[PDB]
């Protein structure tokens with residue numbers, strides 16, 4: 001019958017007390033003639049009823065989609081609490097159950113290293129500014145770039161990759177105009193992680 | 209229920225080297241323990257071919273079956289966009305299952321290869337990272353390797369290709385080395401294999 | 417973001433003197449006036 | 451690997467003077483002899 005997918009909070013939300021982290025439960029393949037869907041939430045077994053369920057949406061493919069959203073406590077996710085979503089639909093022999101938590105393991109502090117363009121790339125109109133972030137655990141992280149107190153949005157970051165020592169690493173690439181670089185402008189790569197003091201760190205990069 | 213099929217493309221390094229043997233693999237799983245008779249049919253751009261090599265089904269640990277058939281292909285055929293279709297017939301199927309695959313369509317683009325040395329802040333470590341940024345290539349099929357003194361270096365981890373903002377892909381390969389090997393002037397090379405490269409190959413050296 | 421909010425939150429989150437109920441209560445306080 | 455083979459294979463592969471069957475043949479030979 002219908003299928004269920006449970007999603008974890010955005011890394012940035014669990015780290016900033018200003019933000020609101022949530023776990024999302026999505027139900028797909030709900031029948032028109034068996035459309036009644038019910039969600040049940042539990043945090044480490046204890047059921048909670050603060051979840052907010054969104055109005056189904058008839059999918060362009062002639063099926064359905066229902067979503068419930070359970071707002072969660074930063075510390076709870078960060079401390080390993082398990083979230084289970086239970087979906088009951090008449091088209092199921094028995095209700096479907098999905099659970100999720102933060103990866104298990106001792107957190108490892110990420111090390112941030114900024115690297116200037118390759119000489120060979122200076123022959124171009126645009127150059128790549130690199131931020132390598134390695135040795136962090138778990139894989140949940142957020143990387144951004146700024147400059148002159150303002151954000152730089154012309155960057156792409158790779159997904160985290162499992163290193164040989166059980167930690168993860170990734171690279172973020174900020175592309176800028178050679179002139180903006182050669183003009184000594186300063187760029188910073190900031191990182192947000194659980195194992196970072198105050199969940200934050202920065203590393204600057206400029207010419208010399 | 210019923211058996212399912214997955215069709216796999218050849219390895220980038222295989223379709224690029226005439227020394228290697230590229231191949232498309234058709235894997236069938238969840239093959240019924242009672243009706244395990246599975247029959248493959250292969251077509252290249254519509255026309256059937258009979259040189260595939262089918263392996264003897266393997267009893268899974270999850271009490272189901274697994275049947276694999278392997279079709280060797282011509283490097284040119286794959287690179288030239290030929291289409292490969294595996295057709296699977298099993299009693300437990302109303303009709304046979306068909307799956308097709310071929311190279312990604314689109315204007316090839318030459319990858320720019322740039323080597324980056326360890327960041328100053330890392331030299332405080334016992335091990336440093338040698339980075340190789342490979343950008344602007346298309347399609348995303350590519351293979352990166354490291355070497356030193358005419359010998360392969362294997363303590364490296366490459367990130368999957370990421371879609372750049374201009375339509376091309378980029379990735380980073382990270383080779384970890386003992387600082388002494390580095391600081392001792394040893395020469396390391398990042399070698400890349402892509403179809404848009406002359407001779408499907410290029411290298412870029414890195415040293416102190 | 418209030419760097420004051422992030423510091424207090426972080427401290428409360430790691431304060432060994434607070435048990436779960438205590439931490440939760442302190443963090444809620446930080447959150448509410450953040 | 452042998453860089454000589456790679457060079458001939460790549461060359462055959464992109465030689466405009468060769469037609470599908472001609473290219474295949476040449477590459478097969480490059481393949482069979484190395």
Ligand SMILES: *[C@@H]1O[C@H](CO[C@H]2O[C@@H](C)[C@@H](O)[C@@H](O)[C@@H]2O)[C@@H](O[C@@H]2O[C@H](CO)[C@@H](O[C@@H]3O[C@H](CO[C@H]4O[C@H](CO)[C@@H](O)[C@H](O)[C@@H]4O[C@@H]4O[C@H](CO)[C@@H](O)[C@H](O)[C@H]4NC(C)=O)[C@@H](O)[C@H](O[C@H]4O[C@H](CO)[C@@H](O)[C@H](O)[C@@H]4O[C@@H]4O[C@H](CO)[C@@H](O)[C@H](O)[C@H]4NC(C)=O)[C@@H]3O)[C@H](O)[C@H]2NC(C)=O)[C@H](O)[C@H]1NC(C)=O
Nearest residue numbers: 003004005007008024026028029059060061062063064065
């Ligand atoms: C009718 O139409 C529906 C609408 O589909 C639309 O999507 C597009 C792509 C196209 O299909 C169009 O038709 C429509 O526009 C269909 O719904 C889809 O149904 C499929 C299943 O058939 C669902 O597939 C799963 O997808 C998730 C990823 O979902 C996220 O990312 C999507 C894009 O990346 C995005 O569209 C989704 O919204 C969702 O986004 C996330 O949303 C949350 C909150 O909403 C946010 O917090 C996130 O930030 C956001 N992320 C992103 C990115 O935006 C994928 O993860 C699932 O993979 C698992 O399950 C597969 C089997 O289903 C399995 O093959 C995979 O290997 C994988 O398995 C998991 O592996 C891990 C290990 O890593 C194990 O630990 C787990 O145990 C294991 N999980 C399980 C369950 O076993 C999966 O592919 C799809 O999400 C859904 N789309 C929408 C929208 O709801 C519907 O199928 C169709 N029906 C029919 C009959 O045609």
Ligand SMILES: *[C@@H]1O[C@H](CO[C@H]2O[C@@H](C)[C@@H](O)[C@@H](O)[C@@H]2O)[C@@H](O[C@@H]2O[C@H](CO)[C@@H](O[C@@H]3O[C@H](CO[C@H]4O[C@H](CO)[C@@H](O)[C@H](O)[C@@H]4O[C@@H]4O[C@H](CO)[C@@H](O)[C@H](O)[C@H]4NC(C)=O)[C@@H](O)[C@H](O[C@H]4O[C@H](CO)[C@@H](O)[C@H](O)[C@@H]4O[C@H]4O[C@H](CO)[C@@H](O)[C@H](O)[C@H]4NC(C)=O)[C@@H]3O)[C@H](O)[C@H]2NC(C)=O)[C@H](O)[C@H]1NC(C)=O
Nearest residue numbers: 212214216217219233235236237238268269270271272274
């Ligand atoms: C009974 O046991 C069987 C064996 O189980 C094995 O797996 C272990 C985890 C254990 O369970 C153990 O028992 C045993 O080792 C199960 O078989 C499995 O069945 C599932 C499907 O039910 C198959 O999933 C597909 O996986 C594909 C990727 O497979 C490769 O990678 C995995 C590891 O990541 C590896 O294990 C596989 O063998 C395979 O490895 C590749 O093999 C190649 C050939 O040798 C080789 O060249 C490669 O190098 C090698 N690669 C790697 C990385 O190792 C996915 O591609 C499939 O995903 C597609 O489909 C799902 C839905 O099925 C979609 O959700 C998903 O999006 C995805 O693609 C869709 O979207 C893309 C766009 O991105 C589009 O192109 C696609 O067209 C589209 N696909 C579809 C179908 O729409 C699958 O997840 C799994 O391969 C198979 N495992 C094996 C070993 O055969 C049985 O399931 C189980 N039965 C029951 C009832 O439990």
